[PDB]
Short mmCIF file of all heavy atoms in Angstrom, two decimals:
data_model
loop_
_atom_site.label_atom_id
_atom_site.label_comp_id
_atom_site.label_asym_id
_atom_site.label_seq_id
_atom_site.Cartn_x
_atom_site.Cartn_y
_atom_site.Cartn_z
N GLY P 1 -37.70 59.60 -225.72
CA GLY P 1 -38.11 59.82 -224.31
C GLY P 1 -38.78 61.17 -224.12
O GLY P 1 -40.00 61.29 -224.05
N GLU P 2 -37.95 62.23 -224.08
CA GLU P 2 -38.33 63.63 -223.83
C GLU P 2 -39.08 64.20 -225.05
O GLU P 2 -40.20 64.65 -224.96
CB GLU P 2 -37.07 64.44 -223.50
CG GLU P 2 -37.27 65.93 -223.42
CD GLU P 2 -36.25 66.64 -222.56
OE1 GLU P 2 -35.07 66.74 -222.95
OE2 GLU P 2 -36.67 67.12 -221.50
N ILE P 3 -38.45 64.18 -226.23
CA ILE P 3 -39.11 64.74 -227.38
C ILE P 3 -40.46 64.05 -227.52
O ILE P 3 -41.42 64.67 -227.90
CB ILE P 3 -38.25 64.69 -228.67
CG1 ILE P 3 -36.75 64.63 -228.43
CG2 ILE P 3 -38.62 65.81 -229.63
CD1 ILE P 3 -36.18 65.81 -227.71
N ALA P 4 -40.55 62.77 -227.23
CA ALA P 4 -41.77 61.95 -227.37
C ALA P 4 -42.83 62.42 -226.39
O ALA P 4 -44.01 62.58 -226.76
CB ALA P 4 -41.48 60.51 -227.14
N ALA P 5 -42.44 62.59 -225.11
CA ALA P 5 -43.35 63.01 -224.06
C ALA P 5 -43.79 64.46 -224.28
O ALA P 5 -44.78 64.88 -223.72
CB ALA P 5 -42.76 62.79 -222.69
N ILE P 6 -43.02 65.25 -225.07
CA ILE P 6 -43.45 66.60 -225.45
C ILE P 6 -44.56 66.45 -226.53
O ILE P 6 -45.45 67.24 -226.55
CB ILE P 6 -42.32 67.48 -225.92
CG1 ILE P 6 -41.23 67.69 -224.85
CG2 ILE P 6 -42.85 68.83 -226.39
CD1 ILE P 6 -40.12 68.65 -225.26
N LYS P 7 -44.37 65.48 -227.39
CA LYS P 7 -45.33 65.26 -228.48
C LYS P 7 -46.60 64.70 -227.85
O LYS P 7 -47.69 65.09 -228.24
CB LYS P 7 -44.71 64.39 -229.58
CG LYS P 7 -43.72 65.11 -230.50
CD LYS P 7 -43.11 64.23 -231.61
CE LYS P 7 -41.80 64.79 -232.12
NZ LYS P 7 -41.56 64.46 -233.55
N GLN P 8 -46.44 63.84 -226.84
CA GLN P 8 -47.60 63.25 -226.10
C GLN P 8 -48.41 64.38 -225.45
O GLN P 8 -49.63 64.29 -225.31
CB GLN P 8 -47.09 62.16 -225.15
CG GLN P 8 -48.07 61.00 -224.93
CD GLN P 8 -48.32 60.17 -226.18
OE1 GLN P 8 -49.26 60.41 -226.92
NE2 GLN P 8 -47.44 59.21 -226.44
N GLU P 9 -47.67 65.42 -225.04
CA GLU P 9 -48.20 66.62 -224.36
C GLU P 9 -48.96 67.54 -225.39
O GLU P 9 -50.03 67.99 -225.06
CB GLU P 9 -47.00 67.29 -223.69
CG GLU P 9 -47.16 68.75 -223.31
CD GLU P 9 -45.88 69.35 -222.73
OE1 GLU P 9 -44.99 68.58 -222.28
OE2 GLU P 9 -45.78 70.61 -222.72
N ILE P 10 -48.34 67.82 -226.52
CA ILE P 10 -49.01 68.59 -227.62
C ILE P 10 -50.31 67.88 -228.01
O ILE P 10 -51.28 68.52 -228.47
CB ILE P 10 -48.09 68.72 -228.84
CG1 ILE P 10 -47.00 69.72 -228.63
CG2 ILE P 10 -48.93 69.04 -230.09
CD1 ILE P 10 -45.71 69.44 -229.33
N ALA P 11 -50.32 66.55 -227.89
CA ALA P 11 -51.52 65.76 -228.16
C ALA P 11 -52.65 66.26 -227.25
O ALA P 11 -53.70 66.73 -227.73
CB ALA P 11 -51.21 64.27 -227.94
N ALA P 12 -52.42 66.17 -225.95
CA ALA P 12 -53.47 66.44 -224.94
C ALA P 12 -53.88 67.89 -224.93
O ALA P 12 -54.95 68.19 -224.43
CB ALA P 12 -52.99 65.95 -223.59
N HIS P 13 -53.00 68.80 -225.38
CA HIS P 13 -53.24 70.23 -225.38
C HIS P 13 -54.11 70.62 -226.54
O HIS P 13 -54.87 71.60 -226.49
CB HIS P 13 -51.92 71.04 -225.46
CG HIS P 13 -52.05 72.46 -225.05
ND1 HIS P 13 -52.05 72.87 -223.75
CD2 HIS P 13 -52.10 73.61 -225.79
CE1 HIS P 13 -52.15 74.19 -223.69
NE2 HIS P 13 -52.17 74.66 -224.93
N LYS P 14 -53.96 69.85 -227.67
CA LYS P 14 -54.80 70.02 -228.83
C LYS P 14 -56.24 69.62 -228.43
O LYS P 14 -57.23 70.32 -228.71
CB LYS P 14 -54.22 69.21 -230.01
CG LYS P 14 -53.29 69.97 -230.94
CD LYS P 14 -53.05 69.37 -232.33
CE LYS P 14 -52.85 70.42 -233.43
NZ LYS P 14 -51.89 69.98 -234.48
N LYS P 15 -56.33 68.49 -227.72
CA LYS P 15 -57.61 68.01 -227.25
C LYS P 15 -58.25 69.10 -226.43
O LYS P 15 -59.22 69.73 -226.83
CB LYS P 15 -57.44 66.72 -226.46
CG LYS P 15 -57.50 65.41 -227.28
CD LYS P 15 -58.49 64.40 -226.75
CE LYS P 15 -58.75 63.24 -227.67
NZ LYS P 15 -59.53 62.18 -226.98
N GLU P 16 -57.62 69.36 -225.28
CA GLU P 16 -57.98 70.38 -224.29
C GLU P 16 -58.46 71.66 -225.01
O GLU P 16 -59.43 72.22 -224.60
CB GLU P 16 -56.78 70.62 -223.36
CG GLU P 16 -56.91 71.81 -222.42
CD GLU P 16 -55.96 71.89 -221.29
OE1 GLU P 16 -55.26 70.83 -220.97
OE2 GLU P 16 -55.89 72.97 -220.65
N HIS P 17 -57.77 72.07 -226.09
CA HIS P 17 -58.19 73.23 -226.90
C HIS P 17 -59.61 72.96 -227.45
O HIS P 17 -60.56 73.75 -227.31
CB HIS P 17 -57.18 73.62 -228.00
CG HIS P 17 -56.03 74.55 -227.61
ND1 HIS P 17 -55.34 75.28 -228.55
CD2 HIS P 17 -55.46 74.87 -226.43
CE1 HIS P 17 -54.41 76.02 -227.96
NE2 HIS P 17 -54.46 75.77 -226.69
N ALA P 18 -59.80 71.78 -228.05
CA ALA P 18 -61.06 71.45 -228.74
C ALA P 18 -62.21 71.37 -227.70
O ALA P 18 -63.32 71.86 -227.97
CB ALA P 18 -60.90 70.19 -229.52
N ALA P 19 -61.94 70.71 -226.61
CA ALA P 19 -62.86 70.46 -225.51
C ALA P 19 -63.41 71.78 -224.95
O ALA P 19 -64.54 71.85 -224.68
CB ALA P 19 -62.22 69.68 -224.43
N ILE P 20 -62.53 72.78 -224.76
CA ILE P 20 -62.95 74.07 -224.23
C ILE P 20 -63.87 74.78 -225.23
O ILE P 20 -64.85 75.44 -224.87
CB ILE P 20 -61.80 74.94 -223.76
CG1 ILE P 20 -60.91 74.23 -222.74
CG2 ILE P 20 -62.34 76.27 -223.20
CD1 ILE P 20 -59.91 75.18 -222.02
N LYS P 21 -63.50 74.67 -226.53
CA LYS P 21 -64.31 75.34 -227.60
C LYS P 21 -65.72 74.69 -227.65
O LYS P 21 -66.73 75.38 -227.77
CB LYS P 21 -63.57 75.31 -228.95
CG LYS P 21 -62.09 75.65 -228.88
CD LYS P 21 -61.50 76.30 -230.14
CE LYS P 21 -60.15 76.96 -229.91
NZ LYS P 21 -59.75 77.86 -231.00
N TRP P 22 -65.77 73.35 -227.59
CA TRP P 22 -67.04 72.58 -227.50
C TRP P 22 -67.84 72.97 -226.30
O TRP P 22 -69.02 73.17 -226.42
CB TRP P 22 -66.73 71.10 -227.58
CG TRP P 22 -66.60 70.70 -229.00
CD1 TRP P 22 -65.47 70.55 -229.76
CD2 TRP P 22 -67.72 70.52 -229.94
NE1 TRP P 22 -65.78 70.26 -231.03
CE2 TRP P 22 -67.13 70.23 -231.17
CE3 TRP P 22 -69.10 70.53 -229.79
CZ2 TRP P 22 -67.91 69.98 -232.31
CZ3 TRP P 22 -69.88 70.28 -230.90
CH2 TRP P 22 -69.30 69.98 -232.17
N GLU P 23 -67.23 73.09 -225.11
CA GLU P 23 -67.95 73.45 -223.93
C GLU P 23 -68.49 74.87 -224.04
O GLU P 23 -69.48 75.16 -223.42
CB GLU P 23 -67.07 73.49 -222.68
CG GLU P 23 -66.59 72.10 -222.22
CD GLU P 23 -67.49 71.36 -221.24
OE1 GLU P 23 -68.72 71.68 -221.19
OE2 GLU P 23 -66.99 70.48 -220.58
N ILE P 24 -67.82 75.73 -224.82
CA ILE P 24 -68.25 77.12 -224.91
C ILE P 24 -69.40 77.24 -225.93
O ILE P 24 -70.37 77.92 -225.70
CB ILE P 24 -67.08 78.05 -225.26
CG1 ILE P 24 -66.33 78.42 -223.97
CG2 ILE P 24 -67.50 79.31 -226.02
CD1 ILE P 24 -64.82 78.43 -224.08
N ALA P 25 -69.25 76.54 -227.08
CA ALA P 25 -70.32 76.40 -228.04
C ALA P 25 -71.62 75.96 -227.35
O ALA P 25 -72.62 76.66 -227.34
CB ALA P 25 -69.87 75.43 -229.11
N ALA P 26 -71.54 74.77 -226.70
CA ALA P 26 -72.72 74.10 -226.01
C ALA P 26 -73.35 75.03 -224.98
O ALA P 26 -74.56 74.94 -224.79
CB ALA P 26 -72.26 72.79 -225.42
N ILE P 27 -72.63 75.92 -224.33
CA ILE P 27 -73.21 76.88 -223.37
C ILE P 27 -74.07 77.86 -224.16
O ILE P 27 -75.21 78.20 -223.80
CB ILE P 27 -72.20 77.59 -222.44
CG1 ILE P 27 -71.54 76.65 -221.45
CG2 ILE P 27 -72.84 78.79 -221.77
CD1 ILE P 27 -70.12 77.07 -221.07
N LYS P 28 -73.54 78.34 -225.29
CA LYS P 28 -74.25 79.28 -226.17
C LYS P 28 -75.44 78.60 -226.87
O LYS P 28 -76.48 79.24 -227.04
CB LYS P 28 -73.20 79.96 -227.10
CG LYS P 28 -72.40 81.06 -226.42
CD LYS P 28 -71.11 81.51 -227.15
CE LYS P 28 -70.38 82.62 -226.39
NZ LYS P 28 -68.98 82.81 -226.89
#
């Protein structure tokens, strides 16, 4: 339940990390 939804959360935060780096690259 909880440990799983924390892992589901680490999932989306990894993405979010990549997406911001891509958006910053693409601006440059």
Side-chain angles (χ1 to χ4, degrees):
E2 171 156 70
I3 335 298
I6 300 184
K7 284 179 202 211
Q8 212 64 265
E9 160 185 342
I10 285 148
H13 197 80
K14 266 198 149 146
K15 271 231 169 171
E16 170 164 348
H17 272 202
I20 304 192
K21 316 210 165 194
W22 276 95
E23 291 271 22
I24 276 140
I27 291 151
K28 283 165 178 165

